[PDB]
Structures are given as C-alpha cells and as structure tokens.
Amino acid sequence: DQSHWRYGGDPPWPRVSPACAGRFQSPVDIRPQLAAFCPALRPLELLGFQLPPLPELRLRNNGHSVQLTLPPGLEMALGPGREYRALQLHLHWGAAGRPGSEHTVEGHRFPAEIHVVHLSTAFARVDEALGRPGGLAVLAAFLEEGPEENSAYEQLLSRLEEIAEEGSETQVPGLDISALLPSDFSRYFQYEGSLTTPPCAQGVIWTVFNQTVMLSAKQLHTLSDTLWGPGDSRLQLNFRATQPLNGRVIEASFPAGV
Amino acid sequence: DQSHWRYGGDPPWPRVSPACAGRFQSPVDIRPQLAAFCPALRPLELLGFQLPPLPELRLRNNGHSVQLTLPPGLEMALGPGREYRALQLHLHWGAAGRPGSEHTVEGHRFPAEIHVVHLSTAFARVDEALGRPGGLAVLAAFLEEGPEENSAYEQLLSRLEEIAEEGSETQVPGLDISALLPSDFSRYFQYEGSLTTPPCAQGVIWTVFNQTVMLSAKQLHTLSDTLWGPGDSRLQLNFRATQPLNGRVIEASFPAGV
Ligand SMILES: *[C@@H]1O[C@H](CO)[C@@H](O[C@@H]2O[C@H](CO)[C@@H](O[C@@H]3O[C@H](CO)[C@@H](O)[C@H](O)[C@@H]3O)[C@H](O)[C@H]2NC(C)=O)[C@H](O)[C@H]1NC(C)=O
Ligand SMILES: *[C@@H]1O[C@H](CO)[C@@H](O[C@@H]2O[C@H](CO)[C@@H](O)[C@H](O)[C@H]2NC(C)=O)[C@H](O)[C@H]1NC(C)=O
Ligand SMILES: [Cl-]
Numbered sequence A, B: 001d002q003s004h005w006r007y008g009g010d011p012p013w014p015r016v017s018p019a020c021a022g023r024f025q026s027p028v029d030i031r032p033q034l035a036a037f038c039p040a041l042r043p044l045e046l047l048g049f050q051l052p053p054l055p056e057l058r059l060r061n062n063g064h065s066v067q068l069t070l071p072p073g074l075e076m077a078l079g080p081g082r083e084y085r086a087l088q089l090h091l092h093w094g095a096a097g098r099p100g101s102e103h104t105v106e107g108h109r110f111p112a113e114i115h116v117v118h119l120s121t122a123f124a125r126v127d128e129a130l131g132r133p134g135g136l137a138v139l140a141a142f143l144e145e146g147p148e149e150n151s152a153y154e155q156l157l158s159r160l161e162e163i164a165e166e167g168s169e170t171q172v173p174g175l176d177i178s179a180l181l182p183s184d185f186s187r188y189f190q191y192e193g194s195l196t197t198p199p200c201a202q203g204v205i206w207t208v209f210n211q212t213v214m215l216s217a218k219q220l221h222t223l224s225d226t227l228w229g230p231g232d233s234r235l236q237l238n239f240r241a242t243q244p245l246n247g248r249v250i251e252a253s254f255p256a257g258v
C-alpha cells in the first residue's frame, strides 16, 4: 500500500513519499517580529463561499481528518494574477489537555487549525499541480478556546458522530464557508511550503490568518474525541511538527513587528 | 465495482450508468445539408499544443482505447471568453475490413476518429463538471485512408507495440498535438451531447472538424490490430452507435448545404 501512513510512528514519511524529506516543508513556526512586511499583500477576496443548502456536500472521516468537499465556483484571490479554486477543507487537532494546531506562533500551539485547500486556475487537475510553485494554495486559521459556542462550526461538529468510523461519510447541507474563517481578511502571514501530509509536495502557497476563530471547550472536545482513525484508535494529535525555514522569509500583510 | 464495461457486450450500458439512457447522447449522425449554419461560430483556436520533447507524456492502453495524457497549459478557445483546458486524447477504430469512427456523416463511417477531451476553465475537477452544461468539451476529427504515411501519427502509432497488453503504459516525447488535427479551423460542426463511454454524462460540447486527417492503410492496420483489450480479445470496434437527436440542432460554422 503506496498510500498509507499515520501520525506518531512508522512508516517514516520519507519512505512513503521522498518529498517529505524536502527543504521547504510545512508547517512552520511563525515569528511575527521576524516576518517581513510586504504592502503589496492586499486583503484576500473570497467569491462564492456563501453556499445555499442544496446541493449538499460530502463530509468524510478519511482516517486522517474530517474533510468537507467543496462544490464548484468557490474562488480565492491572493491578488490579481493569483487566483485559486477551493477544493476541500479539513481540520487538525490535539487531544485531552493537548493543543493540535499545525502552525505555531512564537512556539505557541493553538487548540486546532482549519485548512482550506485550493487549486490554481492554471490547472485542471490537482495531481498536475503537485510540486509546482504556486500550484496549490492553502488558507489556514487557528481555532482558539473561548466561552461561547460557535454556531457556524456547530453545523459540522454536530455531524461528526455520524462519521465516527474511519472511512465513513455523510452529506451535509451547504453552509457559509466564510463563516468558518476569521472576519479580518487584511492581516495574514504568507510563505511557500508543502502539504503537511504525504506526499508532502512543495510549492504550496500558505496564507495564515493573524486573527483567530473561537470555539467553545465543549466544541473542541467534540472535534478531538469523536472520530476513529486507522487501526481502531481515536483520531487525535493529527498534526505534523514544524519544519526548518531553510532561508525562507515569512511575509506579513501588516506591520507585524513591535 | 461500477467502473466496468465493454463494447458490444454485457453489462448493458444503462445498467453501468443510467445516464447512458439519456435523451442527449453522443455520437450522432451529422447531416451537412440539415445542419444550422451559424456565422457567429468563429475559427477554433489551440494554445500551447506545440509541445517540446520534454517532459514526456503518458501513453496508456486502458482496454477501451489508447490514451495520451496531455500536460498542463493546453487550451482550446471556442469563442470569446469560452476556454477549455485539454486533458487527454484517445482514438476510436474498427477492424480488418471495417471502419470505426464514432460520428458519421450522412451515414458514412470513417476508418477512425480522434478525440481531444477538455475541461471548462470554470472547473478544477473533471468529476464536478460531469453532467453540467458546457462543463466538458471534446474536439473530434475523422481519420481517413490515404496513400501516404502520416508522419505526425507515426510518432504515436510506432509506440503501440510497447503497450499491446491491456493496462500497459509507456512514456513518449512531447510532440505537436495540433499536427494530429486538420489544419482548417474554420469549418466544423458543433452540438451538445454526452461522453460516448460510461458514465455517458451529458452537457458535453462536441466540435467535429469538417476536414479529415489522412493515414495510410498500413497505419490504420497498426492502430486497429496492435492492442489487446478486455477478455483475451483484440481491442477493436471500440465505438458507440449514433444516437437519436431528440430535437437537438447541429450547428455548422460554414454554409454546409453548399
Ligand atoms: C497577530 O499578530 C500580532 C502582531 O501584530 C501578534 O502579536 C504579537 O504576539 C507576540 C506573541 O504573543 C507578543 O509577544 C509577547 O509579548 C508579551 C508581553 O511583553 C511577552 O510577555 C511575551 O513573552 C511575548 O514576547 C507580541 O508583543 C505581540 N505584538 C503585538 C503588536 O501585539 C500575534 O501573535 C499574532 N497572532 C497570530 C495568531 O498570528
Ligand atoms: C464537409 O462538408 C462538406 C460540405 O461543405 C460535405 O460535403 C458534402 O457531402 C454531401 C453528402 O456526403 C454531398 O451532398 C455534398 O455533395 C458534399 N458537398 C460538397 C459541397 O462538397 C462533407 O461531407 C463534409 N465532410 C465532413 C467529414 O464533414
Ligand atoms: Cl527540497
């Protein structure tokens, strides 16, 4: 099986996909004081993210996260000339007493992280974009613990019980995908990295919101303690360690220093 | 598993895909004097089709045809703002003493037919375009018998012995894909139809050149007598019968009643 891997042990990821031994991998530790302010980095523009209930969307436990398949027509602009089509979103989380975001900020790990994965409009096929500079783009936001339930996230978290078993899937109504993300589109970090799971292909443009999304502690428990993974254990701690920068400069869309 | 079907045998295709029993199926019999002449149909334009030798391209015997995977960056323009990205091309053929084109012209079947399959620039995923109006576009040309060896086709036909076994594949150098097609881009027929294999999804824009391409008899034999298919039988007669019009209008880009 050329396509099986897990978090927390063998097979080593470079054996699954040699590209996971690359020099420009994700995730990374973001150090705001050392991020370079770039004023050409304009507010992100999201088109078509406010979905009606029909058509419904596939929601699947793939053993590695819960993944929501997005319909056609969702467009994300990093800028004019950097236009992307959204494919799917999924999440990374921890466990009882343990945060599980993938990116960190000055070494701080947040409770969880949402990824929205996009294909550059240059491509008709995700597989052709793998490893090509700017072929894929991921929008990432941190999920922080707060006192109030997040109603937008409850639409998905309340359905995880239906897909607890690995490989199981269900259909959920369309929802406002942009309500899963922060409201500030103007403050973000941006750098070039990789997919954070095998095949770990490089050339991915990462955009990480500076503003967090708040979930209740009960919601974060629902996320991290409902799903089962490969080989009968709870799907938890499904994040990768941060990776060497190897000379990369993380850019900021706002003066990030103090 | 439902990705399973054959030419001229069980399972009956509407079992494979009920969509194959649709009202707007392909191929069709083209009747030039009854096509609607539409002067708004502009000459076709192909961008990026003149490939360099590297990178190489996958050439595969999939048991239903020989299929060449096209690299990123190839586009077909059907009209202002109406672009499609080329994914792959494949062929349909007959047998000893038998033509095997899919489309016919006034009931005449040509020796063989080439299809270049494209995805509308609105989509990032072929699977999402299936069944959607205008989501896919196929460019088709007839292959006719002539006295001279076709040098462009010889680049592919000379490699079929390498992929005689069903499911085998090899790599071929990039070539000028437009040299596999007629040079007259101004005279063609166009109509809305379906994929001609399961899942027979409708909404496909078909464009059929009026000018033919010529292959030698000894090339047409190579095409039709080299590959093996399902069962232990030769891959031959790999075309679908023409389908009822059901009130569809076939358009012509040129006065075809003249
Ligand atoms: C969003 O970006 C802002 C910068 O505009 C980040 O705020 C910066 O965060 C760091 C880490 O929290 C703060 O450093 C800390 O300062 C405290 C107080 O002195 C110190 O005790 C800690 O040891 C640490 O050095 C930094 O001051 C803060 N800067 C500003 C201007 O507020 C923030 O982290 C970003 N958040 C995300 C999620 O990206
Ligand atoms: C290309 O179009 C021409 C017409 O412009 C077709 O030629 C006609 O064919 C029909 C029936 O076969 C005859 O009525 C005509 O006498 C032919 N007309 C002319 C003007 O030559 C031709 O069949 C088309 N070929 C293809 C492959 O589409
Ligand atoms: Cl590298």
Ligand SMILES: [Cl-]
Residues within 6 Å of the ligand: A122, A123, A124, A125, A128, B071, B072, B073
């Ligand atoms: Cl592509």
Ligand SMILES: [Cl-]
Residues within 6 Å of the ligand: A071, A072, A073, A085, B122, B123, B124, B125, B128
């Ligand atoms: Cl799509």
Ligand SMILES: [Zn+2]
Residues within 6 Å of the ligand: A090, A091, A092, A115, A196
């Ligand atoms: Zn992810």
Ligand SMILES: [Zn+2]
Residues within 6 Å of the ligand: B090, B091, B092, B115, B196
């Ligand atoms: Zn075909």
